[PDB]
Write a protein that binds this DNA or RNA. Structure first.
Ligand SMILES: [Mg+2]
Length: 36
RNA sequence: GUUCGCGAAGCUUCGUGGACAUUUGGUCAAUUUGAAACAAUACAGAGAUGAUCAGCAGUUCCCCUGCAUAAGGAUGAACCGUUUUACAAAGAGAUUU
């Protein structure tokens, strides 16, 4: 059948889409720091 | 045109030097030939497995709907096929020098 297992994943870079994702929206702009 | 000065005619009118203001818009030009899709007809037609059916993924130089990192698309699409060598060692028989 085609109900099939696998060998490897992927990572290929295209031109960015420019879509306004919900999570990507700004939040926690301030980074904290340590004392020293 | 505005005007601030000069020179001629009768504050009114011509002739001049300046100052003011200064380069728009087009990745495009209006019907077939620079690329939309559904639909329709005809023809078939539904994942495993015997059959019926659920859902989830996975790979991809396939996308669509979706605000979407939800979710959904025929289990969304194509995958179901082709598949003969890093190839050596031992034994037996045969023709050629
Ligand atoms: Mg289904």
């Amino acid at each position: 059948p085609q109900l099939e297992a696998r060998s490897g994943a992927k990572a290929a870079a295209y031109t960015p889409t420019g879509i306004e994702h919900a999570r990507l929206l700004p939040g926690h702009t301030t980074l904290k720091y340590r004392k020293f």
